[PDB]
From a paper:
Here, we have solved by X-ray crystallography the structure of [name] from [name]. This organism is an extreme thermophilic model organism, which has been described as having an optimal growth ranging from 65°C to 72°C and being resistant to maximum temperatures of 85°C. [name] is a key enzyme in the folate-dependent one carbon metabolism, which is important for the biosynthesis of several amino acids like glycine, alanine and serine, as well as nucleotide bases, formylated methionine and some pro-vitamins. In some bacteria like E. coli, [name] (called [name] in this species) is a dual function enzyme that catalyzes the conversion of 5,10‐methylenetetrahydrofolate and NADP+ to 5,10-methenyltetrahydrofolate and NADPH (dehydrogenase function), and further converts the first product to 10-formyltetrahdrofolate (cyclohydrolase function).
The final model included one chain of TtMTHFD, one NADP+ nucleotide molecule and 60 water molecules in the asymmetric unit. TtMTHFD consists of two α/β-[name] sub-domains connected by two large α-helices, which are at the same time the N-terminal and C-terminal α-helices. The N-terminal α/β-[name] sub-domain is the catalytic domain that binds the main substrate, and the C-terminal α/β-[name] sub-domain is the nucleotide (co-substrate) binding domain, which are variants of the structurally conserved Rossmann dinucleotide-binding domain [name]. Both domains are interconnected by an extended loop-helix-loop motif that we here termed ‘Connector Helix (CH) region’. Compared to the Thermoplasma acidophilum [name] (TaMTHFD) and Acinetobacter baumannii [name] (AbMTHFD) structures, [name] [name] (TtMTHFD) showed an overall RMSD of 0.98 Å (with an overall sequence identity of 36%) and an overall RMSD of 1.29 Å (with an overall sequence identity of 39%), respectively. Conversely, using a cut-off value of 4 Å, a higher amount of salt-bridges in the crystal structure of TtMTHFD (n = 26), when compared with TaMTHFD (n = 16) and AbMTHFD (n = 10), could be identified. Interestingly, again TtMTHFD showed a higher number of inter-chain salt bridges (n = 6) in comparison with TaMTHFD (n = 2) and AbMTHFD (none), indicating the importance of salt bridges for the thermo-stabilization of dimers. Furthermore, TtMTHFD had a higher number of arginine-formed salt-bridges (n = 23) compared with TaMTHFD (n = 5) and AbMTHFD (n = 6), as expected for thermophilic proteins. Thus, an important conclusion is that in TtMTHFD a large amount of salt bridges probably contributes both statically, i.e. through more elevated Coulomb interactions, as well as dynamically, through higher energy dissipation capabilities, to the stabilization of the protein.
Author numbering:
A (entry chain A), B (entry chain A): 1 to 277
Write the structure that this text describes.
């Protein structure tokens, strides 16, 4: 009766196995540059985990830490230098950027073929137009996770709660490519629980700890919890654990989506490399 | 009781009045180039209407007709010539292109600042990322039409049926910017009538004459009919006229969306001009 726990580590390992296999069939090794401004503790931990996993795979991985007060003109110069550096395959800027820096301007400076996070408007535009490109890592990880665990998304009623550029909107675009029926909900949706109750697959990316209660969830739903809420030294999802009483399967926090986000960044780094070479 | 008829001509006229006003406050006049390959009768009629209206506004408007068997290399050369022609503000390629021509390749050749149809992946990517750009004309026309007639889209349940790059997907993106809750449905949605029955605003762009029946429609819904189905020398929408019995307001065919599509192309032509100059 109780919900299965959709572990991200098991699904991420299948991605990592695919990556290791493809590397042997390659002359070179992919090279990832991660840029961080300042010392935000959540930012420090995230990049340390991206770097650690890239290196564990055998990538050339390098974190470039700058002071918080780096001028945006210096950031753009560095990115241009890395765009031209033919030995760098992937360029990643850790968000959030400090307020004196125009984030859109920085992201649009990254060359689209090195844009492993998929935020460049050319990659966004390729995603929604049906073409090839580098797409955002959490949405890729959510789609891959669902397909790993045997969900046939064709014809499924999917509700996505949250409409950010990092998760909800590229997620909605990727789910349409799997022929799902997609509802994008957000903070101005009225009677949100009634909207979510329709979902056979419910994906929540809002950043409110345990916001989603069991009355919001359809019996037998597949629930994917993207939230990562630091609360009392713990990590809390956006979905209340009581949802395991109603859902057929539920993503744990931590260890659900999070591992898949890292895995697909490693996969986007390979892809960016092969798209150039 | 019966549905109001949301005329596109009345809403289009408010756009045209805005355009005429802004032109007097301008030194120059916008210049539109429309390219057509072959002699498809629906294509001929569409471009003739875009040209006629651009000229009626006072634009420099020119249709370049080429043979159907024009090589795609010549098309791309012509577009590059027009991209560099500093006297051309808007470049438009009439679809469908003949099969020997890669449509994505042609559309991506148009400079984004002259891409009055909004298909270039940079304009698609700006739309979904929340930035500024030139967006597709029918979706713009649907949003503007609804706002013209007093629909407050914030918090509304909107269902969009059809997920093309020309209508459904840019429409979904534009509706999110108005804070609607958006459902994208399509040919693989199961129990489509039940999905559409939820919509307070229902937009249909599928190209099946009178497909949508009154049982599919929520009482008091606002129904926007994008279909244009040539049948028995008439023009039939995708929505059955019986829907006027249940809907609060319904877009006629012809004269509903169609006029708004033309108006927003004229508006995108102005915008492209001012974005350069
Ligand atoms: N595990 C991972 O790899 C990973 C990656 C990225 C983010 N995250 C987590 O996901 C969370 C969201 O961050 P984000 O950047 O994706 O999104 P975001 O832009 O920060 O906001 C999330 C969206 O959720 C909606 N929302 C917020 N509160 C709501 C409420 N009470 N009811 C209904 N809707 C509500 C908002 O809609 P409106 O726009 O309409 O206001 C907002 O756009 C964060 O806590 C972050 O830690 C995890
Ligand atoms: N008035 C205007 O300015 C204007 C402009 C453009 C188009 N149109 C009209 O709009 C119509 C659609 O053309 P388009 O290019 O926008 O779209 P399209 O790419 O040709 O197809 C429309 C979409 O509707 C869906 N669909 C088709 N039949 C369906 C059915 N029986 N049940 C549920 N969904 C169905 C399909 O979903 P799937 O992808 O899942 O198969 C398809 O993607 C055309 O007839 C065209 O004349 C009018």
């Amino acid at each position: 009766m109780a919900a299965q726990v959709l572990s991200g580590h098991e699904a991420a390992e299948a991605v990592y196995e695919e990556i290791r296999a493809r590397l042997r069939s390659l002359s070179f090794t992919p090279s990832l540059r991660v840029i961080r401004l300042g010392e935000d503790p959540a930012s420090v931990a995230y990049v340390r985990l991206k770097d650690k996993r890239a290196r564990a795979l055998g990538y050339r991985s390098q974190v470039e830490v700058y002071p918080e007060d780096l001028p945006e003109e210096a950031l753009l110069e560095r990115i241009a230098a890395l765009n031209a550096d033919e030995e760098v395959d992937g360029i990643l800027v850790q968000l959030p950027l400090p307020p004196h820096i125009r984030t859109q301007r920085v992201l649009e400076a990254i060359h689209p073929l090195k844009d492993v996070d998929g935020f460049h408007p050319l990659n966004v535009g390729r995603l929604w137009s049906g073409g090839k490109g580098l797409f955002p890592c959490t949405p890729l990880g959510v789609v891959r996770l669902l397909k790993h665990y045997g969900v046939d998304l064709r014809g499924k009623e999917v509700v996505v709660v949250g409409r950010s550029n990092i998760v909800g909107k590229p997620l909605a675009g990727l789910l349409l490519r799997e022929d799902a029926t997609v509802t994008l909900a957000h903070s101005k949706t009225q009677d949100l629980p009634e909207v979510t109750r329709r979902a056979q697959v419910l994906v929540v990316a809002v950043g409110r700890p345990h916001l989603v209660r069991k009355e919001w969830v359809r019996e037998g739903a597949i629930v994917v919890d993207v939230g990562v809420n630091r609360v009392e030294g713990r990590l809390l999802g956006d979905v209340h654990p009581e949802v395991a009483e109603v859902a057929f399967a539920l993503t744990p926090v931590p260890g659900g989506v999070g591992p898949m986000t890292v895995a697909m960044l490693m996969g986007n780094t390979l892809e960016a490399a092969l798209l150039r070479r």
